């Protein structure tokens, strides 16, 4: 419920799709000029359902729901919020594996130090 920045006009397509008119710069964009200030800038900053700036959900009667990335002028069927999710899941899993490996290497060192200490007692 935040107003449009001055010089901006909301408008519609022949198809009814909303877009925005910048009268100061005399240009048009698919991106609501308020998105700057209200939306997450990255998938990381996303909460809940949110899509980051420049992204949009769309429906196609043949193929179903998909995603539009205005930042790179591309489209995809796979949910970008879910690809990001999994990705961060995969990073954590592999990190705990590296951590377990480092810790286990240190376990070997101490056990070896321990045997060598005992061998010195014998001798």
């Amino acid at each position: 419920e935040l107003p449009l920045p001055e010089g901006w006009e909301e408008a519609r397509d022949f198809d009814g799709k909303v877009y925005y008119i910048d009268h100061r710069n005399r240009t048009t964009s698919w991106i609501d000029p308020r998105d700057r200030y209200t939306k997450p800038l990255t998938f990381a900053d996303c909460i809940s359902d949110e899509l980051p700036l420049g992204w949009e959900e769309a429906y196609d009667p043949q193929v179903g729901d998909y995603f539009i990335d205005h930042n790179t002028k591309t489209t995809q069927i796979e949910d970008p919020r879910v690809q990001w999710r999994r990705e961060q899941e995969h990073m954590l899993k592999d990190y705990l594996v590296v951590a377990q490996e480092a810790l286990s290497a240190q376990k070997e060192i101490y056990q070896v130090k321990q045997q060598r200490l005992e061998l010195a007692q014998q001798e």
């Binding site: 397509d13 877009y19 925005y20 910048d22 005399r26 048009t28 193929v63 998909y66 489209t75 069927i77």
Partner: peptide, 19 residues
């Protein structure tokens, strides 16, 4: 299995508003 191609830019700034 493929998404529709990227539609493109919105309608151009109104030409009757330029000059």
């Amino acid at each position: 299995a493929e998404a529709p191609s990227y539609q493109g830019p919105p309608p151009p700034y109104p030409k009757h508003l330029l000059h």
